[PDB]
Symmetry: C4
Subunit: 241 residues, 4 copies
């Protein structure tokens, strides 16, 4: 709380600071689309590469400033950690030879989420449902795991591409979950060799489908139940009192 501390603290926390960052993101966003065209890149490429290095500099300063202001409270904020790791990624230099990190640089456009509070509320809303499903996700994954193992050893030898490997079978089973080509592309070919392959995949399709629908039904109905508790208690004690 020194006098130097509050100097920067009043900047960082200013609406102009936030607004300025958003301007940059929206600008670097448009810039990253244009960088997609080799035509544009041949003409104006050096400009954009610099604007890019400019922006990432600013964002590094910015993240350093917020760390001064917020201190340990910054590394316990998920939105700040995200901003951190996105900016960290952008710093690993293009010479790294692993172009994956060059492409991951686009994740900085997600600042337009962490910085706009109406976006934060949505993402928070969406994510909020997930912790109640962790056990169902675990059940589903165990299920996938068991069936991946059985598939690999029923079909891996004749169908190595689809089932030669735990991973390949996981992949194929996820594909059948989405029902994408599950019969013409997978199970019908399978059955020219394993005529009962349908006894594996149909029940797999039933379970996995039943569970997902039931997840959604339970979420709606159990929420409506809580809304009803809060209304019961209110009505019932405006009557008692």
């Amino acid at each position: 709380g020194s006098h130097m501390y509050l100097r920067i603290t009043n900047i960082v926390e200013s609406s102009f600071f936030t607004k300025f960052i958003i301007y940059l993101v929206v600008l670097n966003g448009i810039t990253m689309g244009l960088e997609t065209s080799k035509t544009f890149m041949q003409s104006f490429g050096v400009y954009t590469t610099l604007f890019n290095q400019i922006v990432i500099t600013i964002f590094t300063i910015e993240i350093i400033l917020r760390i001064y202001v917020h201190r340990i409270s910054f590394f316990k904020d998920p939105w700040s950690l995200f901003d951190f790791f996105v900016v960290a990624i952008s710093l690993v230099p293009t010479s790294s030879g692993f172009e994956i990190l060059r492409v991951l640089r686009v994740l900085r456009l997600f600042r337009l989420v962490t910085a706009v509070p109406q976006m934060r509320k949505i993402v928070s809303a969406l994510i909020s449902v997930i912790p109640g499903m962790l056990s169902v996700i675990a059940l589903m994954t165990l299920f996938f795991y068991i069936f991946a193992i059985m598939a690999t050893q029923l079909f891996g030898e004749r169908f190595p591409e689809w089932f030669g490997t735990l991973g390949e079978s996981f992949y194929t089973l996820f594909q059948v979950m989405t029902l994408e080509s599950w019969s013409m592309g997978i199970v019908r070919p399978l059955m020219e060799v394993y005529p009962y392959a349908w006894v594996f995949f149909i029940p797999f399709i039933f379970v996995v489908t039943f569970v997902m629908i039931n997840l959604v039904v339970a979420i709606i109905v159990d929420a409506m139940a809580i809304l009803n508790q809060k209304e019961e208690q209110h009505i019932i004690d405006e009557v008692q009192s």
Copy 2:
């Protein structure tokens, strides 16, 4: 409010006027189906072309009359603006050389929506949900935008048809959203060259799917919550009073 004004105002606003338009639309509707058959067109084509020019004349008169009656209130009515722009389109002549406008002429059948009030209520109902989703739509589109950029530069060089271009990648990503052939048609081919391509598309499939379902769940549950507020207040103050 002159005496000439109300002369036409009583026509325009008459049930017979409305009924007459609907008759025409339903007639021009049947006519536009028959115009689809070259057989029919070879026999009776000139008849229909004229009936068509007739109807569009009437509709132009009609729209002019409603503008006299309603004045500035007409250009603040979305149903009137629609009727306007559909009739405007039909006026651009067949010589224009841009047959798109010739085909857009079919949109005049949508008068059967703007003119029948039971239809207006449905469309109004449906559209009513949209303004609350604008922020989610924006989040989704930003998401698509970020992933379109990463895809274009991970896969555009070897897969120009599916990913050579921001637009092509947008297209393909929408296709994967609907899950149409996402694995046999897209990701499996992709992985003969980029074995980890599944680390891109599966999480993309999870997010986009999770969000859409969660949109629907939130709409049902948040509405049921409002219905519960209005019932709380009623019950609670018939008790207080």
Copy 3:
């Protein structure tokens, strides 16, 4: 109400009568599966053909008896009319030369629905939702109709199989509604010739999808609202009284 009338009326209305019919249906049901195997048919075919003619005789008698008992009240009962028309179909003889009616004979197994009251309740439940959707169905069909006409004339000339005809276009548009191969099978081929074909089908996919989901959401939420009216009135007037 004569003494002969009630003689048969007590049979027709007896539990044994109903039970007997169900036995027959379940028996003719098993029989119609076995008739599917040419092996079985070569061995036991003449037996089954007769059992079949037997059963349809009985059912004709049965339907005649119920008409005596129920009189005009029988032709105002949808379950009876169904039983009627299914038995009518079975009477048109195999010599007719239109094997469609030979196959429609299988519809008599649906007696196992019209005769078992737990089934009747389900089907009644399901059908009950439909009259409230008639206007939405009409909107959807008008929509399909307008888009079928535009598609036929944008794409019918180069793509006669998918769009050469109002009917063909209806078909294809229903296929795109279910999203079956809409992109790899239809729109991607289309775009090698009409690069903007995506401006037609994507918005078509949005509308048709939006509407169906919104139909379901409205049904759940509007029902929950009615359940809330009936509970309001009860609570509110046990308080008033």
Copy 4:
């Protein structure tokens, strides 16, 4: 209740016993994944085969102990019966020559469900919805059965792979239910020979789809109705009393 009985009864019922089993399952689970790699199997295969025989021994002892403790109450517990039949399967020796039972051995990983009570609650939750649907399932299956018979005899002769047989037709009809390639893969080929085949499959697609959605809607709305009964009674009699 002898003194020897309670000796083992206190073990079986101990938290350490349960915990120990779970450790084993999670260990044999990891082991069954590694057994998937021929590389690993060539190096460490004999180890795993023994660990496997070890674990199944333990589980046999374990199941015998729980039978002593629980007696007839064990064969009326579905979770115990499952554990039983999974362990029974594992006992049939590898010499049996029916490798299906060798693969079914993986089902022992489902102990991680029967033994962890948070999992039991989920599966119990999910299964709980099913008994109310039995009649709808029956209606659906009758429906499939009737349509399988009609399809087999309309299309079995020209399309033996898809419809030559009651079973083949069942399969294909389930495929059309999931909408997987129903048009490009099935109905479009069908219509080059049977131009009206769409009069069969489209209504089939409507019914089967309508029913499934309606099942889900009814489940949500009928539950919300019960939640409303329990809240009515509470509110209404805190007012009466």
